[PDB]
Amino acid sequence: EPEPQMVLSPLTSAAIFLVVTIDSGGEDTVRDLLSDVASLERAVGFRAQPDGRLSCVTGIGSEAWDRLFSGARPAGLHPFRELDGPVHRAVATPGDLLFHIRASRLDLCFALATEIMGRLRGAVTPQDEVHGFKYFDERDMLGFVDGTENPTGAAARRAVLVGAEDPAFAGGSYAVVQKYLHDIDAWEGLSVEAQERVIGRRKMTDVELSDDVKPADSHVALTSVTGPDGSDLEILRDNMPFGSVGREEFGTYFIGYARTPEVTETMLERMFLGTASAPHDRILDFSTAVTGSLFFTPAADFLEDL
Amino acid sequence: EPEPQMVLSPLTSAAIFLVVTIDSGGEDTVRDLLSDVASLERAVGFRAQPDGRLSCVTGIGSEAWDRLFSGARPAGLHPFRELDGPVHRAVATPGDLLFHIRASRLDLCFALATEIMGRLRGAVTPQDEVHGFKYFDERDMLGFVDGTENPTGAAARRAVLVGAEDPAFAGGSYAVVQKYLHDIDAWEGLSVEAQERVIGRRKMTDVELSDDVKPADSHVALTSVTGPDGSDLEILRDNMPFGSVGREEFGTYFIGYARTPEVTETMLERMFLGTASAPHDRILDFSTAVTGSLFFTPAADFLEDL
Amino acid sequence: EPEPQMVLSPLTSAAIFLVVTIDSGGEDTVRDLLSDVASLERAVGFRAQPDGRLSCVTGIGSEAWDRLFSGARPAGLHPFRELDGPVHRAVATPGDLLFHIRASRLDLCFALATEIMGRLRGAVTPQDEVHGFKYFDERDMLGFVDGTENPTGAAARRAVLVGAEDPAFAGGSYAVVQKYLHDIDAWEGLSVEAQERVIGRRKMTDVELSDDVKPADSHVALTSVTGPDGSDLEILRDNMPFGSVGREEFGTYFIGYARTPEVTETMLERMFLGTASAPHDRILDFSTAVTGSLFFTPAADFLEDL
Amino acid sequence: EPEPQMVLSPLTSAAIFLVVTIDSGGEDTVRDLLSDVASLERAVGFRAQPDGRLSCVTGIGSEAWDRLFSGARPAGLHPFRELDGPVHRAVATPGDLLFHIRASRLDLCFALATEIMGRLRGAVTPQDEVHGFKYFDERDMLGFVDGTENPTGAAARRAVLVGAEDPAFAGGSYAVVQKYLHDIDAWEGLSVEAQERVIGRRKMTDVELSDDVKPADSHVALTSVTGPDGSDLEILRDNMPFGSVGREEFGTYFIGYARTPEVTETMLERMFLGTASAPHDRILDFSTAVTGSLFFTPAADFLEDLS
Amino acid sequence: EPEPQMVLSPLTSAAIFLVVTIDSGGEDTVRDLLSDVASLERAVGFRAQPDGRLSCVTGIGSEAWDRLFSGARPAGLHPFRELDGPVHRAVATPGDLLFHIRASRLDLCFALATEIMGRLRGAVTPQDEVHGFKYFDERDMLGFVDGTENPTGAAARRAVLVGAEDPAFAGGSYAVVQKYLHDIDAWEGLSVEAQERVIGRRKMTDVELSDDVKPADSHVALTSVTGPDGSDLEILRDNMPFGSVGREEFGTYFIGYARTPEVTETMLERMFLGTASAPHDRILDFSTAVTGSLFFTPAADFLEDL
Amino acid sequence: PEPQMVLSPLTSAAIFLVVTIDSGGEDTVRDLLSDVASLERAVGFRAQPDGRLSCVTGIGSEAWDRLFSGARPAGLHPFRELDGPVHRAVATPGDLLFHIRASRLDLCFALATEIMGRLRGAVTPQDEVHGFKYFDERDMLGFVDGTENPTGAAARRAVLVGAEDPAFAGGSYAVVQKYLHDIDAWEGLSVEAQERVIGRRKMTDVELSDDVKPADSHVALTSVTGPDGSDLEILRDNMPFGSVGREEFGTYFIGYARTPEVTETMLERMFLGTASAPHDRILDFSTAVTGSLFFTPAADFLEDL
Ligand code: HEM
Ligand code: HEM
Ligand code: HEM
Ligand code: HEM
């Protein structure tokens, strides 16, 4: 049984997202860190167990994988596909490595980030750094409960982890990241009932709208994908609010894990390109993607044996 | 009799520091907010009780006071005095309003900050915004325990709150803010023993160094001041670590409360200018001040009666 | 000097409200319990200290007072004044003794109520029993945050505690209770915005509506009362949700404490009978009062010295 | 691989038990809700994770099963059997649906119960609604620690979940419910030592009485049952205290889960009908059963795959 | 106003009792420590806040006082008075210094003890060291809730703190320590009903026996002292269970704080010598005192100003 | 089979109880062993939320022959005394081990009282240690202790006996050692020197890089690779203990392993050294005063007895 990384972690209150590119000649330094990352996570985390719940998930990009490793590639590993929709665009931005650091405390995240980046000084260039925070009762920046319909247990494992379809990379996963900025002024201009029609759920109670009320262009409608056998195709999401009040930045940092990127990409396509029934996802009228990257997060045992 | 602001608050793990200048013609919008700031604190904070622990302390600058309030000034209110030492400099930077927001969770701080800043939009320009976090066991970015010798109870009340010396402003207090950036590379180049001689306390156990071992240019020695009376002059500090791993910013946000700014100014002079036996505070060899402002934090009832 | 009961208690998540009438010839049994009530509280409470936060407030009705005691009475102690509005009616129902039992857990409330009723058995007839519970983020059954504008600290003390206006009963207070049942079906028929106009505050954020938007017949407008001297007249409220799903019973148990009943009664009159601007309180269109009683809660020392 | 309901729940300090009968012509509305119950649980409970620990276990009665479904029946599903002993009797009362709602706080229980009943209005009639609360030291209303000898971990899973003996309903369980009211006057009239002889355990320390001093008519003795092979027969119990002080109601709401009702029913028999060495369970001298119903609690996927 | 030591502390679950005598020529070392004890408390306690709840109360005996300090003595300071009763004896044992260390965790206590004894090494001889632990439900070694009738708030302050009757030592207190060893075998041979008659309270529910049911030789009866004033004479107690399973030692470490030792001494006389109504305290038939010492615990600033 | 609570969540308090069985006290002991699990529940259940009470019961090699008939655990033998050039690992008598853990010491004590109450007059106590962990998981030497313990499935394969000895599957081997520290000598060292002794940074608990990590550091000598090339792991639960009056500052070491071979190898490397290292530098500040090996059977084994 291959040990996965802490993809299927419990709910945490704080996150740091770290996206870097690998400078030329930096390959060796990166490789050294990769084999040490698990022990660094344990070194920082153990001090404050068991309420710390510190984890780090390391992701490697498509272009970077070719620079770092020879031999087999994960079947689904490719650069993020840019989506030029009629109205909305899903941009692809550079990213070689992803560090998805989560804890119940921000300091634990920052300490681990410090350690990781300290080792990576002069080998990487930082592309993006986001410090996320749980907002109230699991609500996002739009004021809706965010995470409700995430799969749990065996359903989560089946949706997230690579299996026998790519046996060399079993216990791995695929992560899609996008940084979204919200137009809060426009959003708070809508009535609650109008916002509900945008999301597809009720605001306070988080009850899903009935199928006869739920618009075809609501976020919930478009991100609902049925598979070839009638089964729901699921992803695991850990959206984190971030922001700066002075610069008027109110954002959602989207991260979605799946066993194949094709599930996540189908959702993206429906959202940005639209379908026959829906011009595009209404949430995009209040949200702008400013980054977009795809990573493969290998099994933990892959990282150690380098 | 006069009800003070929550200067003497319980220990909080998160904080937002918000410094703004008042734009020309923005005075009425500011005055309006100041009368509602307490009810915004309750509106955001109440639903998170009792462990939310949300509080906001509002401070007003010297120049800002004259623009806003026609009437008597607090006796100790003046612009931050710039200190130009032989080696180190304490800069004075713009700042009309200070919002010191604390809570057990960052989201509480962010929500209130949004509300305040939403009301002030178009009337203020942001000068500084810092998101602070408690780091492990009350440690600062230098890895030392921070806040040990803070006064408590009545001793704290007596050292912080304006009394009969300025009866029109009883229940008020004076806040000095400075944003410090650390040279962590140089700092981690010192042995622990050398670091302890810089601070004046043991690193791990936080036990004060013996009188005959403690250096004169150590932080503890230079920030220890006895008044003409013979008793210790004390301030209330709530230093918060902050920073960004990508941009390699590791900082301390200093805020000190005192019933008269004279106390805080004496400490600063001792630090930056030095004494007979000490050129300057050794902590300054590893810390650069980038901001510097002084604010009067009125009694709560002063703010409500506008 | 006179020690009050735990009227100004921290916020608790559980409550038991117990209203009984004294049976003929039951006066002696009642007096014995009253002298012992404080010690029963300690006996039950201490086991679960310090997070138990168990307290009991004992109130005595007007008619009950004249049966139990001789000599001087509290100045404002009268039976509940029935209000006959054109539309809405505030009923008065029998109640001699009030037991207001609060704790962070229901078991502590139940164990104390059991000890009290065990000692009173054969002397009292139960009129009303309500088991109350905190509902989410301090929300009531209407979905609004309840308790935001309660006075705190010294302001709460001045609003609640009898002082020099009635020196023989200093440290006492007056409690008004009303059991309200809500018409949830009608309530949920309104949009959120329409509900906000009924209450006078924003639903999710609990921000008070601007004065130029807040309707004259909103709950907040009608319960805001100023005295001749311009100061706000305040009560301490500790409403608790209750109900049963099978009976479609969704209620608010109202309890308001004030130094004089005149304050509570004024608010109650503006709600039920209306003003020049407003016919009645809109909240009553969705709330029916089914009980109504007034009690005096004496100083703790009055109860002991008996 | 079967996905069970949250029968094996962590320790929770609040519960709502809701027992309803299905009105004539209410089958379709009930069918729709059963399909949505897990999503209603998430809607209410997610916002209060992880400390909320909100779960709902849905049970279906024997008579109700035939009205709702057309396929196979669970092997051990039948109406609650009345036990008519010489002194004490275990009554059978009506119940088509059971909602066993648990959380760390009552508010989450009440919210979910509101959502469920909101959808079922005009299709069902409530028979029983009990709001349970944790009482101090995991004690019941008799003042004894309650739940000490519950199976845990793997032993619990084996005693509770249906397996290959009924493969189509694997992941399911059987729930027996009884509402007991206590005679607290008579009970507190006993000495502690005398109460300990009734239960079979020490009151304050909760240590089990030795085999030599433990009476044959004690609760622990009569509810201890060995199989033919000699292994202990176990049930999972999550009794909740409840009551009203003014009405003098001091109660234990009993709920027992087992992979087969035979186990639970054997215990009931020994309690009410007695043995050769014991007339009846001594606890019944201070406890009256006021309700009695049997339900099958299906695997969660059975409820989902109902459209 | 003088600052007292943390004699009135929110009760904790762990304690170390440390009693030492001062060796020849050890006065100087002791004086050095006493002036540092408060800062040692913060050094060990601060970074563990707010959960640690670490405090140290330092007591000084009658003989020790005259070796350490010149000038006035506390009015009530004298050696522990031996009580040679007809059946039971209250022994006196040597002790110059008392350290009463409390926290929520034993490790916090041990760390402070280590620091104190580290500084006192070679100047003192240890007489007693006790590691104390409360049961989860505030029960003592006898299985009874212990601490129920301790005074709280202002009543506690008035009973424990030295006031105007001895103005120079205001804010001080008197501590009496006794280590008791229990005969558990004998105690557990009693039925609960019999044990209740020994104590004077119900075992399970901690309800006090009624006045006419409570035996006169019960613990609660004999330790209930009414002064010529008419009001109750109270002490603050913090009994801590201790023991060794292997050595069959099951003990209660008694410590009682009062503004004058006469209060404690009167109760102690009643327990050991009895009254006209009762031969002795019934608890003593199951409890043997093996140590006895009296200490003055001065105000914090008294120690600081050395 | 059902294992004992060897794989426990982290607890801040512990009592270690080591006793020998007096002559003729075998039957009394057997009776306890069958009830010990139910005593654990009895004391623990009422505090079930946060109690985290558990008891691990171990039996020594000599005691096993006295108590049982027939099959012995393959790896069960008396603790090997190691007499090194400088440092000595002593063997001390021990028949039964009670490893009791909880979030609070009162719970440990309550259980310990029940067990010893029934064992009274049948056993002699050899050792009784009341353990407390520092709030930041630090040991008596001021270093974070437990960082590199295996978790999850890795911990199961390292600790629990499996198919290699099927009759005793679910069992484990515990080695206990009571260490007393020379604190004065320890606090004489600089932080940097202390780090060279341990093999990890003191504050941040980051392992020293392989270029700087000394060969005689604790982490170096206790890092063992088997023939497979895989790392040989044990589960440790070191507890600080002591007395400020007696100047006792100690670590009570306990190590669980699938086979005692792994623990004994680490122990050899520490006391006897390698080619690169004379001995473990931690021993220059730590003296072993007890040493005993026990087999901790599956819970079922004790029940059906
Ligand atoms: C613009 C930023 C976004 C926000 C604020 C957002 C917020 C939400 C909210 C409030 C829900 C409903 C509650 C829940 O189940 O979590 C939801 C559902 C969901 N979102 Fe998003 N979302 C965002 C972007 C995305 C993206 C980019 C994807 C994938 C490409 C995605 C996939 C989903 C899925 C699969 C669901 C569950 C739908 C279902 O009920 O089956 N979201 N999101
Ligand atoms: C460069 C950023 C600074 C850092 C990292 C820092 C850190 C510390 C530390 C570690 C201590 C010892 C522990 C404690 O008692 O809190 C301390 C003490 C103190 N600091 Fe600072 N400090 C800084 C700047 C300042 C400034 C600007 C002032 C006032 C002008 C100040 C005033 C004090 C005082 C009064 C004490 C207590 C000294 C005593 O009486 O023992 N510090 N600081
Ligand atoms: C009248 C209400 C009842 C009360 C107050 C009650 C209370 C208790 C108590 C205090 C215990 C001992 C502690 C424990 O292990 O939980 C216990 C044990 C038990 N009860 Fe009950 N009980 C009741 C009814 C029932 C019923 C109706 C059944 C089954 C049909 C049952 C089955 C059991 C079982 C199986 C045990 C464990 C016995 C053992 O193996 O040690 N109880 N009960
Ligand atoms: C042998 C060790 C002792 C034990 C186990 C013990 C235990 C108890 C218990 C269970 C109570 C009742 C609950 C409470 O209010 O705390 C109590 C009350 C009390 N004890 Fe003790 N006690 C001991 C020694 C002492 C001594 C030596 C004194 C006096 C010097 C003392 C003074 C008191 C007082 C004043 C009360 C409160 C009486 C009242 O209800 O007003 N105790 N003790």
Residue numbers in the entry:
A (entry chain A), B (entry chain C), C (entry chain D), E (entry chain B): 7 to 312
D (entry chain F): 7 to 313
F (entry chain E): 8 to 312
Lines quoted from the article behind this entry:
A widely applicable approach is the use of photocaged substrates, where the photocage is soaked into the crystal in advance and then activated using a laser pulse to provide uniform initiation of the reaction throughout the crystal. This work characterizes photocage release of nitric oxide and binding of this ligand to two heme protein systems, cytochrome c′-β and dye-decolourizing peroxidase B using a fixed target sample delivery system. In this work, we describe a thorough characterization of the application of the NO photocage N,N′-bis-(carb­oxy­methyl)-N,N′-di­nitroso-1,4-phenyl­enedi­amine (henceforth referred to as NO cage) to room-temperature microcrystals of two proteins: a gas binding cytochrome c′ (McCP-β) and a dye-decolourizing peroxidase B (DtpB). Laser parameters for photoactivation are systematically explored, and time-resolved structures over timescales ranging from 100 µs to 1.4 s using synchrotron and XFEL beamlines are described. We have demonstrated a sample and time efficient approach using fixed targets to carry out time-resolved SSX and SFX experiments with an NO photocage over the microsecond to second time regimes.
On binding to the heme, NO was observed to bind in an end-on fashion via the nitro­gen atom with an Fe—N distance of approximately 2.0–2.5 Å and an Fe—N—O angle of approximately 105–150°. The variability in these values occurs across the six independent heme groups within the crystallographic model and could represent either genuine differences in binding due to subtle differences in the crystalline environments or simply uncertainty in modelling a small ligand into the electron density features. A small shift in the side-chain position of Asn245 was observed compared with the ‘empty’ site structure in all six of the hemes, and at all laser powers and timepoints. An intriguing observation was that of differing occupancies for the released NO within the different (chemically identical) monomers of the homo-oligomeric proteins, particularly for the hexameric DtpB (in contrast, McCP-β is a homodimer). One possible explanation would be differences in the proximity to the bulk solvent channels in which the photocage molecules presumably are present, although no correlation was seen between chains with higher NO occupancy between the differing laser powers. Assessment of occupancies in light-activated processes remains challenging, particularly for small ligands such as the diatomic NO. For our experiments with DtpB, we found both B-factor and Fo − Fc peak height quantification to give results that display the same occupancy trend with laser power, but both generally overestimate NO occupancy compared with multicopy refinement [Fig. 6(f) and Table S4]. For DtpB, the structure of the NO ferric heme complex of this or any other B-type DyP have not been previously determined, and thus we have demonstrated here that such a complex rapidly forms on exposure to NO after photocage release.
